[PDB]
Coordinates of C-alpha atoms and ligand atoms in Angstrom, one line a residue:
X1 CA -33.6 2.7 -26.2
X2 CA -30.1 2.0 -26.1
X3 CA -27.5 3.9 -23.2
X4 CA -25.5 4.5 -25.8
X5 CA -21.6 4.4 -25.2
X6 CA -20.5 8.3 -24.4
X7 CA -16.9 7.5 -24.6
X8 CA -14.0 5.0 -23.6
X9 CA -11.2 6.0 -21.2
X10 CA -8.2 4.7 -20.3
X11 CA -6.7 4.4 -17.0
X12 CA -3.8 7.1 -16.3
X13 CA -0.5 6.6 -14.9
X14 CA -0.2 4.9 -11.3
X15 CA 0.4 6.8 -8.3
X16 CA 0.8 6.2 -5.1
X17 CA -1.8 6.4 -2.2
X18 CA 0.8 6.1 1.1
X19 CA 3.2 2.9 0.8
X20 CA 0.1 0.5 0.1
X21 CA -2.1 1.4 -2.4
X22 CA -1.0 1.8 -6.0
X23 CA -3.5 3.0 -7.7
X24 CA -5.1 4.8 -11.1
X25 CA -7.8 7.1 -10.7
X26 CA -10.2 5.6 -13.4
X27 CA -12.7 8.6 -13.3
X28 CA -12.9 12.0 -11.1
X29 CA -15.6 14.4 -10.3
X30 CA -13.0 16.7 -12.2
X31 CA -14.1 15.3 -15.3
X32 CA -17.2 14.6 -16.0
X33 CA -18.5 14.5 -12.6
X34 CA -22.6 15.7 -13.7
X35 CA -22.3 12.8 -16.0
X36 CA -20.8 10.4 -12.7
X37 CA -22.8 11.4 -10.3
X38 CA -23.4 10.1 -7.5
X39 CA -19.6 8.4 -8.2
X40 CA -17.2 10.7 -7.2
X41 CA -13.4 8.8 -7.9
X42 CA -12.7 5.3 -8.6
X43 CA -9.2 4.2 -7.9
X44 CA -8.1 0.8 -9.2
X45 CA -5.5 -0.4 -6.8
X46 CA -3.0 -3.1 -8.1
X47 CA -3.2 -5.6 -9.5
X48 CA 1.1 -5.3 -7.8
X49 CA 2.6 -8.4 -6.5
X50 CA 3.9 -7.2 -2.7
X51 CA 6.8 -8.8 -0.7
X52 CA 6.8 -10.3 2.1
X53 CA 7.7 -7.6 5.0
X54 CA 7.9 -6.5 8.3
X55 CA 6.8 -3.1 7.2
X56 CA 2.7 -2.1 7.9
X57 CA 2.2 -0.5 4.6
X58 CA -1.0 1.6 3.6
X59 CA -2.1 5.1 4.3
X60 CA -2.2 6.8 7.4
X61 CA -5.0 8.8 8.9
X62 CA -6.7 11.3 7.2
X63 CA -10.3 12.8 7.4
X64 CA -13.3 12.7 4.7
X65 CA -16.0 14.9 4.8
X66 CA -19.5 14.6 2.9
X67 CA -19.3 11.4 1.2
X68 CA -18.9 7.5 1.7
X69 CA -15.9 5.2 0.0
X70 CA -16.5 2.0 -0.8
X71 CA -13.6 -0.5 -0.5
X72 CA -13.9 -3.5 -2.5
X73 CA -11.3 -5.9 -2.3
X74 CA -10.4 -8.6 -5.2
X75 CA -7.0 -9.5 -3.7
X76 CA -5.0 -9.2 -0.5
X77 CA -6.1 -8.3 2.6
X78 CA -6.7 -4.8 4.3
X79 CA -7.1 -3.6 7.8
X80 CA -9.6 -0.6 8.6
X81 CA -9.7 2.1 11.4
X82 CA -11.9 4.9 11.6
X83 CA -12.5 7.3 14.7
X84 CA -16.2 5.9 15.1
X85 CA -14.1 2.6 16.7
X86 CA -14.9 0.3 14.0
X87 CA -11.8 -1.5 12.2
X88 CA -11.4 -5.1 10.4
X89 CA -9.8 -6.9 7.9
X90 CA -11.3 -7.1 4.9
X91 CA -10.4 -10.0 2.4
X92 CA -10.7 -11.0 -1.0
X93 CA -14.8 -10.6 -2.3
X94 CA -15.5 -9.0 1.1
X95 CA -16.7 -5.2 0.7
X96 CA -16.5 -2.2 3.1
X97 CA -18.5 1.1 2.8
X98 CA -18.0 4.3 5.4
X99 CA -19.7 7.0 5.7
X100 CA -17.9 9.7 6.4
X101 CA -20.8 12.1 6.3
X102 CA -20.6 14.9 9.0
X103 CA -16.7 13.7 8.9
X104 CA -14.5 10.9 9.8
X105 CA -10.6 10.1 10.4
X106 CA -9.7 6.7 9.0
X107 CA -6.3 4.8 8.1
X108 CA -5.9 1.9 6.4
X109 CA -3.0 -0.8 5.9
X110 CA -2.1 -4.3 4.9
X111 CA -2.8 -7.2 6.6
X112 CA -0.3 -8.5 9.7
X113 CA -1.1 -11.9 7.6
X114 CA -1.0 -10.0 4.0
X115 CA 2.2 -8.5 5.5
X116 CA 4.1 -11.7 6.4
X117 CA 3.1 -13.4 3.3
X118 CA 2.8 -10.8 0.5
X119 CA 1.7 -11.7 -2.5
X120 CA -1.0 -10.4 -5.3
X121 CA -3.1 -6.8 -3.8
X122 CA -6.0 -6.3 -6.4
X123 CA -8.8 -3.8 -5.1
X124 CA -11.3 -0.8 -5.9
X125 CA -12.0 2.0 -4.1
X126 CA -14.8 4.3 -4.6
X127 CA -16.1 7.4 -3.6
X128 CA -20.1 7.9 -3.2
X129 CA -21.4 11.5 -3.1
X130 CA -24.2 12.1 -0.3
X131 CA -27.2 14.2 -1.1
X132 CA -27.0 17.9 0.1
X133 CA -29.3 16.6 3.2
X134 CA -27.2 13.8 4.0
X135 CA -23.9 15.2 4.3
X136 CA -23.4 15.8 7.8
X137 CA -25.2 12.4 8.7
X138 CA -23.3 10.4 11.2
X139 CA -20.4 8.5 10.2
X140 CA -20.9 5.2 10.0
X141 CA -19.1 1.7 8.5
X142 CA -21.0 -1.2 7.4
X143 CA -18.7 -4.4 6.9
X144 CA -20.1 -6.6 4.2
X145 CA -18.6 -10.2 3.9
X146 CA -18.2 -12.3 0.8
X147 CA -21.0 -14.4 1.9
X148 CA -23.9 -11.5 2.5
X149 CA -23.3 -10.3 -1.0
X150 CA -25.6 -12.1 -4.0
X151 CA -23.7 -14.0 -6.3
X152 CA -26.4 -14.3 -9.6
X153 CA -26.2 -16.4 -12.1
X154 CA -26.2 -15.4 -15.4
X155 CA -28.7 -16.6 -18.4
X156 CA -27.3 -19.1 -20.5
X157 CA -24.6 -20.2 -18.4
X158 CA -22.7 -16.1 -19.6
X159 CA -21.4 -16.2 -16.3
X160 CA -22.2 -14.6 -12.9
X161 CA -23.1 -11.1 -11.3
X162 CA -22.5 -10.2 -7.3
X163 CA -24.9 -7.4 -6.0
X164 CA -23.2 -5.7 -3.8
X165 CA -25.5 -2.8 -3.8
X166 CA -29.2 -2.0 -5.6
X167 CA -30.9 -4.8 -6.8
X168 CA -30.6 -7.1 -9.9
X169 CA -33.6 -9.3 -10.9
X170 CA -35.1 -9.7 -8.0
X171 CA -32.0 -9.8 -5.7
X172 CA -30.8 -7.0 -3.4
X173 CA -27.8 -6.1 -2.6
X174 CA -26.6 -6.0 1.5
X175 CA -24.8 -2.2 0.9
X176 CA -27.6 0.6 2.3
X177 CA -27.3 3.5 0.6
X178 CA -28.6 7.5 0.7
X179 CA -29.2 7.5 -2.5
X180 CA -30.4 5.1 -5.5
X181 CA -27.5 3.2 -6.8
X182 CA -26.3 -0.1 -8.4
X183 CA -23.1 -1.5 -8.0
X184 CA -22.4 -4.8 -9.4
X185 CA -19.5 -6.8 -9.9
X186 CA -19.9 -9.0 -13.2
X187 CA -17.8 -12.1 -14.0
X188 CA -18.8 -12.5 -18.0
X189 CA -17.6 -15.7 -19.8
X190 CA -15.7 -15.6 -23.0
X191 CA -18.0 -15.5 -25.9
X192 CA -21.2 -15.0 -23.4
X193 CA -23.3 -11.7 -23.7
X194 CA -25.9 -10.3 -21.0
X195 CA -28.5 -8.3 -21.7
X196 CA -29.1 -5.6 -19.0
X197 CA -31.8 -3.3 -17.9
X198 CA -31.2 0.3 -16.0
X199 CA -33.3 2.5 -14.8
X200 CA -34.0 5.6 -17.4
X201 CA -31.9 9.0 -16.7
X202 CA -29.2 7.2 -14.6
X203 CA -25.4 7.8 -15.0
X204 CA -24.0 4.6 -15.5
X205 CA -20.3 3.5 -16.3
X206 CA -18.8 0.3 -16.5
X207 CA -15.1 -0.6 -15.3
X208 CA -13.1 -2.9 -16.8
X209 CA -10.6 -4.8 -14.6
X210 CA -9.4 -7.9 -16.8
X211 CA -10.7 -9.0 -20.6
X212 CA -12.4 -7.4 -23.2
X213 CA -15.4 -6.3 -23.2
X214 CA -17.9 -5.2 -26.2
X215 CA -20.3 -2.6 -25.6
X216 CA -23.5 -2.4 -27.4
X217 CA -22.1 -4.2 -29.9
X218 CA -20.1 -1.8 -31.4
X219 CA -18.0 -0.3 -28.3
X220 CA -14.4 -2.4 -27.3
X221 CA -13.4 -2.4 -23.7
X222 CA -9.8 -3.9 -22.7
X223 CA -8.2 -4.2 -19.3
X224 CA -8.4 -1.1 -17.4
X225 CA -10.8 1.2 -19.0
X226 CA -13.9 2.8 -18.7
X227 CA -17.1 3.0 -20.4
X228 CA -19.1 5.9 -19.7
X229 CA -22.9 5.4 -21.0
X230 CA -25.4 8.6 -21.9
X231 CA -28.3 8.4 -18.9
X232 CA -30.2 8.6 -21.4
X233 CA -31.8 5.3 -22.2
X234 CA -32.5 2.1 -20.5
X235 CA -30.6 -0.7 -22.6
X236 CA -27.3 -2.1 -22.1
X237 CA -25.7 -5.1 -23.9
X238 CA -22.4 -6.4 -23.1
X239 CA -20.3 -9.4 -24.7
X240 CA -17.2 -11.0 -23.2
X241 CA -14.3 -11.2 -26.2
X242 CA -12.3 -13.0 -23.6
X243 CA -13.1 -13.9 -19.3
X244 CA -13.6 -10.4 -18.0
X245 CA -14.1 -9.1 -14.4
X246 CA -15.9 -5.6 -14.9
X247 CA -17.9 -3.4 -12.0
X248 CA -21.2 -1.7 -13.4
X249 CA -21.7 1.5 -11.7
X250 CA -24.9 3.4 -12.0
X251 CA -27.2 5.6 -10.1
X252 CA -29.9 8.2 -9.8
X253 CA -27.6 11.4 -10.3
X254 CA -27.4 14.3 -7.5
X255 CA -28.7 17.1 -9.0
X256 CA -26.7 19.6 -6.8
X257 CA -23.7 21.3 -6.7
X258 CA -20.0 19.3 -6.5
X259 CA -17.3 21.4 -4.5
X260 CA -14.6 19.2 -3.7
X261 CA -11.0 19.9 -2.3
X262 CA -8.7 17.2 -1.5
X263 CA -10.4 14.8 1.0
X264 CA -13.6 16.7 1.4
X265 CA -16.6 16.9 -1.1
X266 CA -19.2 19.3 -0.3
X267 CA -22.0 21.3 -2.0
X268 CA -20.2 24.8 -1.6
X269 CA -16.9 26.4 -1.3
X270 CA -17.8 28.1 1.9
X271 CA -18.5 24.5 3.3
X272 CA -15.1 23.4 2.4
X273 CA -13.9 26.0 4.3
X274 CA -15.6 24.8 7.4
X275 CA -14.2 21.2 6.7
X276 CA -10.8 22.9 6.7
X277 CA -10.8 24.6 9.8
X278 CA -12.8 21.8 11.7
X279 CA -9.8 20.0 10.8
X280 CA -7.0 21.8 11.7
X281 CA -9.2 23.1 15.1
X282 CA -8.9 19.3 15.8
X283 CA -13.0 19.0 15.6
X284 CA -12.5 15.7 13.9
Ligands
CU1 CU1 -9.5 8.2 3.0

């Protein structure tokens, strides 16, 4: 059986995330979030030409509570700090995900060489929910490089897919996870199809960055939009009307409640409350 295509959703508006990320929030936990789970928020950053500058543009630091984002960048470069002392750059095809779990500060800007140079900033960010029992695990950052994430090739030549986490045919991907969860980035040639398999009952959605993309044969796809699939079902087929670049999210949901409030995500409202006042008793 088929996970046949729930709906297609354009991207809203761009806003602005600090001076360096402008983004569109592709999907929320406001909307939909049962049929998400465990994806919280996906904002598309870019793709915006920057200028050369002296400036350090990006966001400044903030806290997370109860979740992990996922950074993965396309184009540009981006420098990370969190309060567990890790920081980096990642670059284009490299991937970071942070836990934030019991709660985190982080910031994160341009490049000093991104900076100096400017040009094209393409990236995704996305938020992962932690099971109830994970949520106040340690905070943590795993820094994945282009070259530790599986780059498959495609049957008949349709292109190629990079696991950066679950598993496709055999390969898995380098991201650990709380929770079962796919996340594949999917290069699909022009007038090439795949055929793909998911596990039964899991949300799945697919994001389209560039092309157009038909879904199950009868579903179209263009730049920016998403296709949200019914869990139910294990069949997917996509076909590439032109070169497309699309993300295929999918995952066992979290069968518990979603109580978020701006940076925090947690199971309850009273928990929210702690987040708050850990924050501003300067816990974090
Ligand atoms: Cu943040």
């Amino acid at each position: 059986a088929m996970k046949k295509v729930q709906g297609i959703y354009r991207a809203p508006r761009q806003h602005w995330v600090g001076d360096g990320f402008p983004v569109r929030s592709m999907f929320s936990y406001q909307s939909h979030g049962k049929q998400l789970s465990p994806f919280l928020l996906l904002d598309y950053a870019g793709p915006m030409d920057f200028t050369p500058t002296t400036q350090r543009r990006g966001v400044g630091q903030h806290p997370h509570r109860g979740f992990e984002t996922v950074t993965i960048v396309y184009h540009g470069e981006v420098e990370h700090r969190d309060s567990t002392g890790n920081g980096g750059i990642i670059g284009p095809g490299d991937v970071q995900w942070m836990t934030a779990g019991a709660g985190i500060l982080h910031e994160e800007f341009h490049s000093d060489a991104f900076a100096q140079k400017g040009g094209p900033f393409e990236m995704v960010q996305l938020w992962v929910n932690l099971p109830a029992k994970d949520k106040m695990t340690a905070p943590g950052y795993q820094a994945i490089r282009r070259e530790a994430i599986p780059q498959v090739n495609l049957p008949d030549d349709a292109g190629n897919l990079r696991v950066i986490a679950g598993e496709y045919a055999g390969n898995i991907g380098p991201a650990k996870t709380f929770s079962p969860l796919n996340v594949w980035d999917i290069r699909l040639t022009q007038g090439k199809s795949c055929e793909f398999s998911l596990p039964a009952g899991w949300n799945t959605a697919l994001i389209v960055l560039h092309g157009t993309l038909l879904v199950n044969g009868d579903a179209i796809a263009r730049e920016a939009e998403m296709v949200l699939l019914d869990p139910t079902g294990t069949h997917l087929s996509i076909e590439a009307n032109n070169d497309t670049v699309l993300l295929l999210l999918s995952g066992e949901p979290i069968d518990e409640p979603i109580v978020g409030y701006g940076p925090f995500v947690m199971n309850t409202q009273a928990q929210i409350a702690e987040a708050i006042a850990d924050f501003n008793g300067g816990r974090f």
